């Protein structure tokens, strides 16, 4: 009858204590999206900057080039994780 959090979005959380009271146990099975909650699948530098600005919801500044100094500074072989 009591839930600390509404269990309808992420997972159903059940909190418990071990008999000794030393360990807290959490059971969290994932919540799956129902069928009913779903929906069926249906079947000129100046002007250019403005077009791009509007399309991607940015300011104009991003779309202007930068000089040789900045271009050549950039790391073309950056370290990759994972």
């Amino acid at each position: 009858t009591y839930s600390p959090l509404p269990d309808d979005y992420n997972c159903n959380v059940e909190l418990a204590l071990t008999s000794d009271g030393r360990t807290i146990v959490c059971y969290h099975p994932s919540v799956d999206i129902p069928y009913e909650h779903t929906k069926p699948i249906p079947r000129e530098e100046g002007p250019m900057i403005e077009q791009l600005s509007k399309m991607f919801f940015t300011t104009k500044h991003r779309w202007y080039p930068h000089g040789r100094y900045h271009r050549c500074r950039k790391n073309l072989n950056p370290p990759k994780d994972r």
Binding site: L15, G21, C26
Partner: protein
């Protein structure tokens, strides 16, 4: 000139190697380079403090965000987790928020549960049994 420095090139180069990535005449002229390099090194040393500080504010920001998803405030979460005798630092909690969201919801649930136990204890002045999650493991 009985004695004169023959190794001045290398002495200059020691300072200059650190200046290569600077812009302007700072990168190549020693008189200007040395001054900027001293500043660079000083900044580098002092930046260690800020690194640690900035990480912690980042973690708190992230924890706040994740807690707010579950309708819990940052102080509430941290406070109640401590009262549950769980000792998870801010770095780990931020990591859990990003990578283990089910676990984070569990922790948010636990914090919220403990919070309500606190309120019930506060409201119920006098002789009342301790909350189930409220009771603490004693070490001797």
């Amino acid at each position: 000139l009985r004695n004169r420095v023959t190794d001045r090139y290398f002495r200059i180069q020691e300072v200059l190697k650190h200046a290569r990535h600077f812009r302007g005449r700072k990168n190549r002229c020693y008189r200007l380079a040395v001054r900027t390099v001293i500043r660079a090194f000083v900044k580098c040393t002092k930046a260690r403090y800020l690194k640690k500080k900035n990480m912690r504010t980042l973690w708190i920001n992230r924890i706040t965000a994740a807690s707010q998803e579950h309708g819990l405030k940052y102080p509430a979460l941290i406070g109640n987790l401590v009262k549950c005798q769980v000792e998870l630092n801010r770095k780990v909690l931020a990591d859990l928020a990003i990578y283990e969201p089910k676990t984070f919801k569990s922790l948010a649930a636990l914090a919220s549960r403990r919070r309500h136990e606190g309120f019930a204890a506060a409201l119920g002045d006098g002789k009342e049994p301790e909350g189930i999650f409220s009771r603490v493991v004693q070490y001797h």
